């Protein structure tokens, strides 16, 4: 097949590290050229990668990364033209101490946008575990985003198996008071309390000063605890979202799931399964939920490539024999799909030699229109019609580097044909559909110093925050 | 790190065995196999010996060929018999001569002394430290002498550089000497040792006695008592002492040691159904069937006791520290050992490990069998004529010797006008390697050959014959090479004798290889004086007048010989009548002992004659055997163990032939058997010659071993002399002049097969070699210059081709005169590879700044010793995979390995001591593509007086210049090869690693190898900077050095340590460490911080991330300090606490552990940490192992182990949000794990244990019983007895592994046997695991019933879980898949369904090729691999010779490709490989 002679290679220095990527990539319908699908990788005298590039930047002669390191040569402060210069910093003992990102491009780059988080620990005699962490607003105030209140070793903490343990992760969105644990180490209950008003968008969830004697102003009335009981196998015996939801489960002679029953809030607990059949691989085979339908699934047993699935209401069902679906599916040597169909009319696919998708023709429902930032109305009721899902073609296109170009389409049943095209940065992954901007160099101005987008789908309001 | 947490046993495992350790070969050719010993580590240090067979080993208590003997200090005797005087010479157990040492000023290491370990001695005393002729490692050694030697004894002390210290010969049992007057000390023996912690081990010897002896032995051997046996080892002293105990008056009681190894020769009941006892009763140790003596130290050396059971004893309640009264130690475990016994030899049939249940039921490991080549003469075949020879003898028509380094002789009829017709053995064309014939003669230019005492021998010991000159006035010889080089005449200040009568000419007893002449007989002893073919004066002595007088030349129907019927190698005097025979004990210098008779012979004495008699040893022991002729037969009498003679064998002569006084018998190795085949001529008819057939092997070589897990060793073994004739023959087919520097015969291991016990796959391994070498002055095997090594796996198939390994290698023989030649042998398809690693030599001096060396050329004498010391050093190797390719001739890779020596002054002025170093490697990697290897070189630059690698470097090299086309296949787009080159290739890279140590070595101390300081720095350079041969060390040490320290390097890093205790961070006596020192940052690595921080925040972040300033090491002139951390903070008591861990820390920034001990500090009983979590454990001191734990929540976790010390069940119980929870306390629910898997297949939910497991390894052999067999044979059990005696069946009634074939051979027995066996398969070693779904607080524990299957070779085979009933495959009673007639699996409902997993077509490298699919099955039994091969889908792993799947094939035939090159690797998938 023309797919032949597309191999991948790796090529090394005399240190023995691969100085480049190699593949051999062909667009199938223009088969004369195989791309220069290869790229630079560069490593220091410590054998640690200093650089690698998009080939499309190489003749442009502009670099893409920075890395900086210690004795023992671990990365410290590091940048790429998409990621921005970024730090997480750690103890001798590897404990985290501080985290920062969102620093500008002149080189005198502005750490007043550092978006800081930093970490706080036990003292002797205790081993030095993290009792807390705080946000710090870059260049400004720190606030204690959490505590991890470690227990003592009272007979109580023994009983609860909380000896030394975080009995109180006071946290963003409030507290989880870890308040019982098993001899099997599994937790047995924890009072998830929200904030004093969790739908208050601005109460801190930050835990400054002495103790919760203050933060009672900030933890919820919503004491939506969870409670748990456990098998010696560690599988759940029962668990209960203390607002009133609860669960139970049971298993076969070996350990596969055989049944479960799940209490909705304060209700009875009821089984989910009517009939069960797995494959010997433990994958499914023939099941009937409380739904009462026969469904079955059929696969390459060597690989579980599902060749198809069928569903009917069975003969003798409460609503009698009725086939509901019969899907069939097709696959390549490595196992990429190529087509699917169903009955109760077909769809089919193409890929680069890279397996980078290029085509996805099929059938799609009339009247849905060309896709926007929307969900249409459903067709209601469910069409018994043979046709309203009219046949169509759709296709994909992609950069030399890891970026898309376009989706391109025809709806010949309605002539509703169109193409989607992406504007993208001269120099980064920053890029969007060309009607936001057509300019592939204006487009890069639109993103934060951490490379998140400055504004929403069409410029609407958005704020990014700590934890990113 | 900190001292380990309280830790559970594994809680799991797999079925596996032990002793699985057959060794690889080497240029010595003396293949050997070793096994470790199944006994404890004590508290952490314990006796660490290990047993071995060797092809080259003699007899012992281990039986013939085996070895586990520990060590002693002893004389040489290859130099002949000891004087028992000052001028005798003595040897390390390291195998090297032990000179006296020299000081700085080149004076001896000696003094009078009056303390040791500061212990002021009970006397004035005298001491001398000692030095070997060769150092590998720098142990300090001293001899000890009373100032008046008669006052008690001298003795010996040992100081290893690691401080490990040992003593020899305080006590009689710790000594060996003349039993009559021990002033003739043979040896001093190891007796005790102390650890730096003041642990100890002691080593008992038992002396000889008359137990189980009898009248004949009593009459003959009233001298045995000096013999010794290693009867017990003991360890775990009741209380510490860092000095030796035996400094004391006398060693404390038996109770004061806690672990013991005990050795027994059949005293306690060998029955499997009796556990032995620490006390042995009074049955008394047996004496071997095949008893004999040695003589070689000039004394009686009777050899009698062989062990059969070895016993591990634990003083349990003292180990518990609980009780001490009558704490008779438990027999922890019993190694059991079984031998074949014969009138002349015994050696192991088998061994097995055993332990015991508390009810005393044994439990067993699989046995381990052996079968060395048994000499037998029921074997012996008939005669054949010798067309090759048929008339060339019969008095004068024969002449013979090997001259041409042959190992077997040329015939050479040769006279005064002598023909010199060197008719010599050549390989027959065709047939096997063993086929041989005698070809053309060759006369040669040669000596006067007349009237000279002109005769055959090498007399000087030269490996070259010395054709004798002794005529009227004229004396000397001419020496003849293997080349036929008749050297010029040799006058030598020879001092030959009068030869007055040639009668009674002595030869041997002077010493092996240096034979010398003494006319002698009754009442007097003339003396030799030959050294290496020169002489001192001869002398007169006599042996004592009571000794019987051997006497020569009286023809009165009798014979004499200098011949070793005793097989010592000393060709003892024997006198031989038709009725009586007598042999004199060798006493070497001037003497023999009173002679012993031998028995087992007579003839009708009135019918007898002298001669008609022949004397060759034929049993291969050395004990010369006897033949008589008879009117139509030969009578062959074989020597019982060197003591008596078997019933004579009656051999019919060839038909119609009768032997008579014309006829001449002889024995010589016709076929390359390595022992003499039979030979004769009857000079009656024109044809005259015959051989007789004998055997196909040299006897007593191990030949095969097995484990009852189903292992084998198909040992194959070949004459090195045949090898020489082959090397000769093939290089003469190459027309080259041959000259193997080994003339000397021995028979060596050669090849083996191994087999897949279940799949019937197999593998071949081959050992091959060239340039045989021997010492032309010392008579010593100098190795082979080249080795060649080869192998293949092989398979039952189905497409996969095997590709034989081939590799070639070179080793120093220490003889330039051939060592030079190997340079021809190196493959040079590659070309730009650099000059051969050239061996080099140096000497240390005490220069200022702590000394130096000069590399130098010493004398050629010195070089003799240098090269001999280098002998065996592995020089080079070159390695390939075999195929029809134009790269079969190209190796995957090649290596050469430079060696360098320091020569050393000595009290021996004749030669220096020396030591050697493998100072470099260089290593070219081709992937069998010759165009352009990657290569690297690694080198040591600097070292101390004790050779530490004070500086070293390593180098990688830039790529070769851009070639014009790809050598690789055109499958790659040319864009690959033409882009395969980069600026990054243009680069050389060079590590420097430099370091220095401490050396606490004054006075008593000898502490060496003490880590201290290290730094590394790096360079990179332009490819245009290096020389075309590459840089050598000798190059870049020069002042011009391109890498000169003025060049700006990269400082790679440093490291350091601080020792604790009172030596200023330098080591204390135990060298305990205060902390490890751990760098972080400097003005080079700050740049990340420079990107972000001010000075204050920078400094803060160092101090907060845990770092401090410290000095920078190997400081260069301008170099600032560096930021670092430090680690490991830990503390210990003294010896009174055995310096056990008290409390230990990783870092000051984090918590510290504290650890709590039993009274003996045997184990940490408890621990608590920084967070104060106290932890409990309790231990079974059978195995010193924790059966119990508790956490700080009071959660118990608990385990039990079998008496073999292996986990068998577990549970946990504790608290649960404050309720009590878990399983019961065990004593609250004492419980029985099912005894059998068939029982466990019906276990119930709710057992009080979280898990258990059950096992059957020995199931690989079928089990039988007396009643089972009697229900066929109805003798009701005497057959069962006979079979057990015959080792067909084990004592526990299994069929014995070799037994299976052993019996159907020895007694033929048939399907009569198969009746007991056939439908019970060999059942793979297997086990069932169980774990319980819930604590026994809930009875509805779902039962996780999973079986598993293992071997000794890949270990786990497969495993399966019981699963819910339904459609499944079915296994046949014949283990097949049950099939429909069309072969479809019997895919039908089963109740007993299994999910079956992990099966695959395993391989001998350890993987598997065909990864089989899993499935459902009905059965816990193993299904047939034949059916699996027929039916079951699997991808094929196409491993390369490096074991790397260059390809995989899917079960559906699509493929994944790869190929590897030194510079790059190509890869392809199932869609892309579809080029077909």
Say what the alpha-carbon torsion angle B1309, B1312, B1313, B1314 is, to the nearest 10 degrees. Answer: 130
Residue A430 near residue A444, CB atoms below 8 Å: yes
DSSP code of residue B653: P
The dihedral of CA B319, B322, B323, B327: what is its sign? negative
DSSP secondary structure of B200-229: EEEEEEEE---TT--HHHHHH-TTGGG-EE
Q: Which chain A residues contact residue B1171 at CB under 8 A?
A: 125-127, 129, 150, 153, 164
Greatest Cα pair distance in chain B:
119
Q: Is B1150 helix (H, G, I), strand (E, B) or coil?
A: coil
Residue B329 near residue B313, CB atoms below 8 Å: yes
As a whole number of angstroms, the distance between CA B1410 and CA B1368 comes to: 22
Could B956 and A127 be called an inter-chain contact, meaning their C-beta atoms sit closer than 8 Å? no
Closest alpha carbon within chain B to A125? B1170
As a whole number of angstroms, the distance between CA B1215 and CA B527 comes to: 92
Six-digit token string for B102: 């020299």
As a whole number of angstroms, the distance between CA B921 and CA B1137 comes to: 46
DSSP secondary structure of B1316-1340: TTTTS--PPPEEEEEEBSS-TTSS-
The dihedral of CA B586, B591, B596, B598: what is its sign? positive
CB neighbour list of residue B122: distance below 8 Å, 6 or more residues apart: none
As a whole number of angstroms, the distance between CA B1174 and CA B1156 comes to: 10
Which residue among A13, A125, A129 places its CB closest to the CB of B985? A13
Residues in chain B: 1476
Which residue among B957, B1343, B1463 places its CB closest to the CB of A12? B1463
Q: Is B726 helix (H, G, I), strand (E, B) or coil?
A: helix
Backbone phi and psi for residue B1017, each to the nearest 5 degrees, phi listed first: -140, 155
Residue B1427 near residue B1376, CB atoms below 8 Å: yes
Residue with tokens 């081993």: A127
DSSP secondary structure of B350-379: EEEEEEE-TT--EEE---EEB------STT
As a whole number of angstroms, the distance between CA A166 and CA A178 comes to: 7
Q: Please list the alpha-helical segments (H only) found in B1241-1357.
A: 1266-1273, 1278-1285, 1299-1306, 1311-1314
CB neighbour list of residue B1164: distance below 8 Å, 6 or more residues apart: B3, B4, B6, B1141, B1155, B1156, B1157, B1177
As a whole number of angstroms, the distance between CA B745 and CA B721 comes to: 6
Experimental structure resolution, Å: 6.4
Residue B1342 near residue A251, CB atoms below 8 Å: yes
Six-digit token string for B430: 């065709």
As a whole number of angstroms, the distance between CA B1249 and CA B1213 comes to: 10
Q: What secondary structure, in 3-state letters, does B1108-1127 show?
A: EEECCCCCCCCCCCEEEEEE
Residue B548 near residue B594, CB atoms below 8 Å: yes
As a whole number of angstroms, the distance between CA B983 and CA A14 comes to: 11
As a whole number of angstroms, the distance between CA A38 and CA A11 comes to: 10
As a whole number of angstroms, the distance between CA B21 and CA B592 comes to: 45
Say what the alpha-carbon torsion angle A208, A209, A211, A212 is, to the nearest 10 degrees. Answer: -40
As a whole number of angstroms, the distance between CA B75 and CA B88 comes to: 7
Residue A368 near residue A355, CB atoms below 8 Å: no
Which residue among A45, A77, A164 places its CB closest to the CB of B1173? A164
Strands B476-480 and B525-526: unpaired
Six-digit token string for B1094: 């001010």
The dihedral of CA B74, B75, B80, B81: what is its sign? negative
Q: Is B1302 helix (H, G, I), strand (E, B) or coil?
A: helix
Strand partners, B312: B261, B333
Residue B658 near residue B632, CB atoms below 8 Å: yes
What is the CA B253 to chain-centroid distance, rounded? 36
As a whole number of angstroms, the distance between CA B928 and CA B893 comes to: 7
Sheet holding A404-410, edge to edge: A273-275, A286-289, A294-300, A305-313, A322-331, A337-341, A346-351, A357-365, A389-398, A404-410, A418-424, A431-433
Q: Please measure the distance between the N-terminal and C-terminal CA atoms of chain A and give it in whole angstroms.
A: 47
**Peptide bond just before A125 cis, omega within 30 deg:** yes
As a whole number of angstroms, the distance between CA B1146 and CA B1143 comes to: 11
As a whole number of angstroms, the distance between CA B592 and CA B295 comes to: 11
Residue B958 near residue B986, CB atoms below 8 Å: yes
As a whole number of angstroms, the distance between CA A55 and CA A400 comes to: 8
As a whole number of angstroms, the distance between CA A357 and CA A286 comes to: 32
Which residue among B1079, B1091, B1106 places its CB closest to the CB of A68? B1091
Q: Which residues of B329-352 are buried (b: 16+ CB within 10 A; e: fewer)?
A: bbbbbbbbbbbbeeebbbbbbbbb
* Count of pairs with CB atoms under 8 A, one residue in A, one in B: 246
Report the alpha-carbon angle A77-A81-A84, nearest 5: 40
The CA-atom distances, in angstroms, between B1114 and each of B950, B1076, B1082 are: 12, 17, 15
As a whole number of angstroms, the distance between CA B52 and CA B406 comes to: 32
Closest alpha carbon within chain B to A127? B1151
Residue B625 near residue B619, CB atoms below 8 Å: yes
Could B1193 and A4 be called an inter-chain contact, meaning their C-beta atoms sit closer than 8 Å? no
Q: Please measure the distance between the N-terminal and C-terminal CA atoms of chain B and give it in whole angstroms.
A: 57
Strands B257-264 and B228-237: antiparallel
- The backbone region for B80, taken as left when phi is positive above 0, alpha when psi lies in -120 to 50, beta otherwise, is left
Number of H-type helices and E-type strands within chain A: 3, 32
Backbone phi and psi for residue A369, each to the nearest 5 degrees, phi listed first: 75, 175
- Burial of B901 (C-beta count, 10 Å sphere; 0-12/13-18/19+): buried
As a whole number of angstroms, the distance between CA B451 and CA B475 comes to: 11
The CA-atom distances, in angstroms, between B1030 and each of B839, B1024, B1026, B1034 are: 17, 11, 6, 11
Residue B425 near residue B725, CB atoms below 8 Å: yes
Q: Is B1263 helix (H, G, I), strand (E, B) or coil?
A: strand
Count other C-beta atoms under 10 Å from residue B15's C-beta: 23
Residue B141 near residue B96, CB atoms below 8 Å: no
Backbone phi and psi for residue A213, each to the nearest 5 degrees, phi listed first: -50, -35
Strand partners, B263: B310
How many Å lie between the alpha carbon of A77 and the closest alpha carbon of chain B?
5
DSSP code of residue A182: -
How many Å lie between the alpha carbon of B442 and the closest alpha carbon of chain A?
59
The dihedral of CA A116, A117, A123, A127: what is its sign? negative
Closest alpha carbon within chain A to B1472? A4
DSSP code of residue B1238: H
DSSP code of residue B802: P
Residue with tokens 């099997």: A184
DSSP secondary structure of B844-905: EE--TTT-EEEE----HHHHHHHHHHHTT-EEEEEEEE-SSSTTTTS-SEEEEEEEEEEEE-
What is the CA B1436 to chain-centroid distance, rounded? 36
Which residue among A1, A9, A128 places its CB closest to the CB of B1466? A9
Identify the residue among B1144, B1189, B1472 best suited for mutation to test binding to A, counting A beta carbons within 10 A and taking the highest: B1472
**Peptide bond just before A267 cis, omega within 30 deg:** no
How many Å lie between the alpha carbon of A281 and the closest alpha carbon of chain B?
8
Say what the alpha-carbon torsion angle B700, B704, B708, B710 is, to the nearest 10 degrees. Answer: -170
Obtained via which technique?
cryo-EM
Which residue from B981, B1032, B1025, B1463 is spatially nearest to A14, judged by alpha carbons? B1463
Strands B893-904 and B840-845: parallel
Please give the helix or strand (H or E) that residue A348 lies within, else none.
strand A346-351
As a whole number of angstroms, the distance between CA B278 and CA B312 comes to: 9
Greatest Cα pair distance in chain A:
78
Query: HSE-up of A85 (CA within 13 Å, CB side)?
Result: 19
Which residue from B909, B1137, B779 is spatially nearest to B106, judged by alpha carbons? B909
Q: Is B1383 helix (H, G, I), strand (E, B) or coil?
A: coil
Residue B32 near residue B53, CB atoms below 8 Å: yes
As a whole number of angstroms, the distance between CA B1018 and CA A370 comes to: 63
As a whole number of angstroms, the distance between CA B602 and CA A371 comes to: 117
Q: Is A382 helix (H, G, I), strand (E, B) or coil?
A: coil
CB neighbour list of residue B808: distance below 8 Å, 6 or more residues apart: B786, B787, B788, B789, B825, B827, B877, B878, B879
Backbone phi and psi for residue B1357, each to the nearest 5 degrees, phi listed first: -100, -50
As a whole number of angstroms, the distance between CA B583 and CA B592 comes to: 10
Residue with tokens 């987008």: A453
As a whole number of angstroms, the distance between CA B1035 and CA B720 comes to: 42
Please give the helix or strand (H or E) that residue B1080 lies within, else none.
strand B1073-1081
Residues in chain A: 468
Identify the residue among A70, A113, A236, A279 best suited for mutation to test binding to B, counting B beta carbons within 10 A and taking the highest: A70
Residue B1370 near residue B1377, CB atoms below 8 Å: yes
Strand partners, B821: none
Residue B1250 near residue B1210, CB atoms below 8 Å: yes
Backbone phi and psi for residue A73, each to the nearest 5 degrees, phi listed first: 65, 15
Q: Please list the alpha-helical segments (H only) found in B199-328.
A: 215-220, 316-319
Backbone phi and psi for residue B305, each to the nearest 5 degrees, phi listed first: -105, 125
Backbone phi and psi for residue B639, each to the nearest 5 degrees, phi listed first: -75, 115
- Burial of A77 (C-beta count, 10 Å sphere; 0-12/13-18/19+): buried
Angle of helix B1266-1273 versus helix B1278-1285 axis, rounded to 10: 120
Q: Please list the alpha-helical segments (H only) found in B181-309.
A: 215-220
Count other C-beta atoms under 10 Å from residue B1150's C-beta: 21
Six-digit token string for B1033: 């060390």
As a whole number of angstroms, the distance between CA A67 and CA A50 comes to: 6
Six-digit token string for B335: 């190694």
CB neighbour list of residue A225: distance below 8 Å, 6 or more residues apart: A179, A189, A190, A191, A192, A193, A242
Which residue from B800, B710, B560 is spatially nearest to B1437, judged by alpha carbons? B800
């Amino acid at each position: 097949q023309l797919f032949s002679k597309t191999p991948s290679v790796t090529v090394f220095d005399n240190r023995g590290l691969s100085v480049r990527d190699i593949a051999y990539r062909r667009h199938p319908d223009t088969p004369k050229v195989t791309e220069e699908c290869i790229t630079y990788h560069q490593f220091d005298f410590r054998g640690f990668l200093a650089q690698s590039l998009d080939p499309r930047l190489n003749h442009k002669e502009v670099t893409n990364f920075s890395y900086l390191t210690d004795l023992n040569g671990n990365i410290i402060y590091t940048q790429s033209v998409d990621a921005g210069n970024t730090l997480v910093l750690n103890d001798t003992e590897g404990r985290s101490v501080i985290a920062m990102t969102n620093i500008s491009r002149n080189g005198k780059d502005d750490l007043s946008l550092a978006v800081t988080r930093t970490f706080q620990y036990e003292n002797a005699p205790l081993p030095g575990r993290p009792l807390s962490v705080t946000e710090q607003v870059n260049g400004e105030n720190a606030r204690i985003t959490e505590h991890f209140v470690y227990a003592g070793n009272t007979p109580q903490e023994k009983n609860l198996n909380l000896a030394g343990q975080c009995v109180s992760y006071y946290d963003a969105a409030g507290l989880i008071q870890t308040d019982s644990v098993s001899l099997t180490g599994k937790p047995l209950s924890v009072s998830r309390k929200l904030l004093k008003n969790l739908d208050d968008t601005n109460i801190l969830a930050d835990w400054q000063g002495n103790d919760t004697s203050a933060w009672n102003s900030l933890l919820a009335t919503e004491i939506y605890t969870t409670v748990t009981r456990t098998d010696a196998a560690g599988a759940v015996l029962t668990t209960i979202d203390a607002v009133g939801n609860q669960q139970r489960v049971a298993f076969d002679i070996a350990g596969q799931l055989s049944a479960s029953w799940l209490t909705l809030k304060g209700g009875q607990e009821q089984v989910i399964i009517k009939v069960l059949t797995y494959s010997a691989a433990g994958q499914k085979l023939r099941e009937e939920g409380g739904n009462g339908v026969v469904t079955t699934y059929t696969y390459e047993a060597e690989t579980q490539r599902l060749i198809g699935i069928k569903t009917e209401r069975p003969n003798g069902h409460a609503a009698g024999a009725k086939v509901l679906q019969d899907l069939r599916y097709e696959y390549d040597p490595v196992g990429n799909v190529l087509s699917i169909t169903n009955d109760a009319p077909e769809n089919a696919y193409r890929y680069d030699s890279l397996y980078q998708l290029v085509s996805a023709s099929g059938r799609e429902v009339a009247g849905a229109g060309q896709q926007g930032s929307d969900l249409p109305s459903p067709l209601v009721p469910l069409p018994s019609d043979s046709s309203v899902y009219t046949n169509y073609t759709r296709t994909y296109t992609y950069d030399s580097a890891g970026n898309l170009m376009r989706i391109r389409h025809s709806a010949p049943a309605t002539n509703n044909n169109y193409t989607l095209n992406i504007t993208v940065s001269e120099r980064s992954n920053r890029g969007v559909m060309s009607s936001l901007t057509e300019n592939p160099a204006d487009v890069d101005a639109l993103f934060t110093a951490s490379g998140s987008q400055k504004c929403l789908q069409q410029g609407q309001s958005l704020i990014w925050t700590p934890r990113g | 790190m900190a001292i380990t947490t309280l830790s559970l046993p594994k809680g799991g495992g797999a079925i596996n065995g032990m002793g699985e350790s057959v060794g690889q070969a080497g240029p010595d050719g003396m293949v050997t196999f070793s096994i470790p010993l199944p006994f404890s580590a004590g508290r952490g240090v314990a006796p660490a010996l290990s047993l071995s067979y060797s092809s080259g080993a003699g007899n012992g208590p281990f039986g013939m060929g085996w070895q586990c003997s520990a060590m002693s200090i002893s004389r040489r005797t290859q130099k002949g018999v000891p004087q028992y005087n000052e001028d005798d010479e003595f040897l390390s157990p390291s195998g090297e001569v032990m000179a006296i040492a020299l000081n700085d000023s080149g004076f001896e290491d000696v003094r009078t002394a009056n303390r040791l370990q500061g212990i002021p001695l009970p006397f004035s005393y005298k001491v001398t430290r000692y030095q070997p002729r060769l150092i590998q490692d720098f142990i300090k050694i001293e001899y000890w002498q009373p100032v008046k030697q008669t006052d008690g004894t001298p003795f010996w002390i040992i100081y290893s550089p690691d401080g490990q210290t040992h003593i020899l010969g305080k006590n009689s049992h710790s000594r060996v000497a003349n039993a009559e007057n021990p002033s003739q000390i043979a040896s001093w023996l190891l007796e005790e040792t102390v650890t730096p912690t003041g642990e100890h081990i002691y080593y008992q010897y038992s002396g000889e006695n008359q137990v189980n002896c009898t009248d004949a032995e009593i009459a003959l051997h009233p001298q045995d008592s000096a013999q010794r046996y290693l009867a017990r080892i003991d360890y775990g002293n009741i209380s510490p002492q860092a000095s030796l105990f035996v400094l004391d008056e006398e060693l404390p009681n038996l109770t004061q040691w806690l672990f013991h190894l005990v050795f027994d020769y059949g005293e306690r009941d060998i029955s499997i159904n009796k556990i032995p006892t620490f006390e042995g009763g009074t049955t008394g140790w047996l004496a071997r069937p095949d008893m004999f003596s040695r003589y070689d130290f000039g004394i009686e050396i009777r050899n009698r006791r062989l062990c059969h059971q070895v016993l591990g004893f634990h003083r349990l309640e003292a180990l518990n520290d609980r009780d001490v009264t009558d704490e008779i130690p438990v027999l922890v475990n019993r190694l059991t050992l079984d031998y074949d016994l014969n009138n002349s030899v015994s050696t192991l049939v088998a061994v097995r490990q055993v332990a015991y249940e508390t009810d005393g039921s044994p439990i067993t490991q699989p046995p381990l069998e052996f079968d060395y080549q048994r000499f037998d003469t029921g074997s012996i075949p008939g005669w054949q004529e010798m067309p090759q020879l048929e008339a060339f003898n019969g008095y004068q028509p024969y002449q013979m010797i090997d001259l041409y380094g042959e190992g077997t002789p040329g015939i050479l009829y040769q006279e005064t006008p002598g023909a010199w017709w060197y008719k010599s053995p050549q390989r027959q064309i065709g047939g096997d390697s063993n086929a041989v014939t005698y070809g053309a003669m060759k006369a040669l230019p040669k000596i006067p050959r007349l009237q000279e005492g002109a005769t055959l021998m090498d007399i000087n010991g030269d490996g070259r014959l010395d054709w004798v000159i002794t005529s009227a006035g004229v004396r000397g010889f001419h020496s003849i090479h293997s080349t036929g080089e008749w050297t010029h005449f040799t006058p030598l200040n020879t001092l030959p004798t009068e030869y007055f009568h040639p009668k009674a000419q002595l030869a041997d007893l002077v010493g092996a290889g240096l034979s010398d002449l003494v006319l002698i007989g009754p009442k007097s002893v003339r003396l030799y004086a030959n050294q290496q073919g020169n002489w001192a004066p001869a002398q007169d002595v006599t042996q004592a007048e009571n000794v019987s007088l051997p006497v020569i030349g009286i023809d009165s129907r009798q014979l004499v010989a200098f011949a070793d019927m005793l097989g010592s190698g000393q060709q003892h005097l024997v006198e031989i009548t038709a009725d009586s025979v007598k042999c004199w004990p060798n006493m070497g210098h001037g003497r023999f002992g009173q002679p012993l008779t031998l028995e087992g012979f007579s003839q009708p004495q009135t019918s007898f004659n002298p001669d008609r008699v022949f004397l060759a040893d034929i049993d291969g022991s050395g004990t010369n055997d006897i033949i008589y002729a008879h009117s139509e037969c030969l009578e062959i009498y074989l020597n019982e163990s060197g003591n008596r003679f078997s019933k004579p064998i009656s051999l019919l002569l060839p038909d119609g032939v009768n032997f008579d006084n014309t006829c001449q018998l002889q024995a010589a190795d016709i076929q390359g058997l390595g022992i003499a085949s039979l030979v004769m001529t009857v000079p009656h008819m024109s044809p005259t010659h015959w051989r007789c057939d004998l055997a196909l092997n040299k006897p007593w070589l191990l030949n095969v071993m097995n484990n009852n897990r189903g292992a084998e060793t198909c040992l194959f073994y070949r004459s090195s002399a045949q090898f020489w004739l082959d090397e000769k023959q093939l290089v003469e087919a190459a027309g080259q002049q041959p000259e193997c520097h080994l003339p000397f015969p021995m028979h060596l291991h050669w090849r083996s097969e191994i087999f897949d016990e279940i799949t019937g796959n197999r593998l071949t391994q081959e050992q091959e070699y060239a340039h045989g070498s021997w010492d032309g002055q010392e008579r010593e095997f100098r190795g082979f210059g080249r080795l060649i090594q080869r192998d293949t796996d092989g398979f039952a198939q189905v497409d996969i081709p095997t590709h034989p390994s081939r590799t070639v290698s070179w080793f120093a023989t220490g003889i330039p005169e051939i060592d030079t030649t190997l340079s021809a042998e190196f493959w040079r398809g590659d070309d730009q590879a650099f000059s051969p690693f050239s061996p080099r030599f140096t000497r240390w001096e005490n220069d200022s700044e702590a000394g130096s060396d000069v590399a130098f050329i010493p004398s050629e004498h010195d070089a003799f010793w240098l090269n001999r010391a280098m002998k065996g050093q592995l020089l080079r190797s070159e390695l390939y995979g075999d195929d029809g390719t134009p790269e079969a001739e190209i190796p995957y890779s090649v290596t050469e390995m430079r060696h360098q020596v320091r020569a050393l002054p000595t009290t021996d002025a004749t030669v220096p001591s020396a030591w050697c170093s493998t100072i470099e490697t260089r290593s070219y990697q081709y992937q069998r593509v010759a165009a352009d290897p990657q290569c690297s070189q690694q080198v040591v630059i600097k070292a101390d007086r004790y050779g530490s690698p004070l500086l070293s470097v390593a180098i990688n090299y830039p790529r070769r210049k851009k070639p014009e086309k790809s050598p690789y296949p055109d499958d790659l787009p040319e864009t690959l090869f033409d882009s395969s080159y980069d600026t990054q290739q243009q680069q050389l890279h060079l590590t420097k690693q430099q370091q220095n140590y401490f050396h606490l070595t004054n006075d008593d101390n000898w502490l060496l190898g003490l880590p201290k300081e290290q730094r590394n720095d790096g360079y990179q350079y332009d490819q245009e900077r290096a020389p075309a041969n590459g840089f050598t060390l000798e190059t870049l040490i020069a002042s011009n050095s391109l890498i000169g320290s003025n060049q700006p390097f990269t400082y790679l890093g440093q490291s350091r340590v601080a020792y604790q205790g009172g030596v200023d961070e330098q080591p204390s006596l135990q060298a305990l460490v205060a902390y490890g020192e751990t760098a972080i940052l400097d003005e080079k690595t700050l740049q990340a911080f420079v990107g972000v921080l001010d000075s204050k925040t920078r400094d803060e972040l160092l101090f907060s991330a845990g770092y401090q300033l410290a000095p920078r090491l190997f400081r260069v002139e301008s170099e600032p300090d560096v930021w670092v951390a430090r680690q490991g903070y830990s503390e210990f008591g003294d010896y009174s606490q055995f310096w056990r861990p008290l409390s230990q820390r990783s870092t000051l920034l984090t918590g510290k552990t504290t650890l709590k001990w039993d009274k003996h500090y045997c184990v940490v009983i408890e621990t608590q940490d920084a967070a104060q979590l106290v932890t409990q454990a309790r231990y079974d001191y059978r195995f010193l192992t924790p059966y119990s734990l508790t956490d700080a929540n009071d959660n118990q976790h608990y385990v039990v182990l079998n008496p073999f010390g292996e986990v068998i069940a577990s549970r946990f119980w504790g608290t649960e949000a404050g309720k009590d929870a878990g399983y019961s306390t065990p004593q609250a629910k004492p419980f029985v794990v099912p005894a059998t898997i068939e029982a466990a297949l019906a276990l119930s939910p709710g057992i009080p244990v979280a898990h258990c497991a059950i096992f059957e390894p020995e199931s690989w052999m079928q089990k039988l019983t007396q009643h089972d067999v009697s229900e066929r044979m109805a003798d009701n059990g005497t057959l069962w007895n006979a079979l057990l005696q015959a080792r067909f069946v084990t004592e526990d009634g299994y069929v014995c592994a070799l037994g299976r074939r052993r019996w159907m051979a020895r007694h033929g027995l048939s399907v009569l046997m198969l009746t007991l066996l056939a439908e019970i398969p060999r059942t793979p070693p297997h086990s069932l695991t169980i774990t319980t779904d819930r604590y026994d607080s809930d009875d509805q524990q779902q039962l996780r019933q999973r079986i598993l299957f293992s071997d000794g070779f890949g270990r786990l085979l497969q495993s399966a879980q019981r699963v819910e009933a339904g459609e499944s495959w079915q296994r046949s009673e014949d283990s097949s898949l049950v099939v429909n007639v069309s072969g479809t699996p019997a895919l039908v409902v089963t109740d007993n369904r299994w999910a079956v997993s992990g099966r695959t077509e395993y391989d001998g490298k350890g993987q598997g090729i065909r990864v089989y699919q899993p499935y459902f099955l009905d059965d816990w039994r193993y299904l047939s691999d034949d059916s699996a091969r027929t039916d079951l889908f699997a991808d094929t792993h196409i491993y390369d010779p490096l074991g790397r799947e260059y390809q995989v094939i899917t079960a559906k035939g699509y493929r994944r490709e790869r190929q590897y090159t030194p510079w790059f690797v190509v890869n392809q998938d199932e869609n892309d490989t579809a080029a077909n």
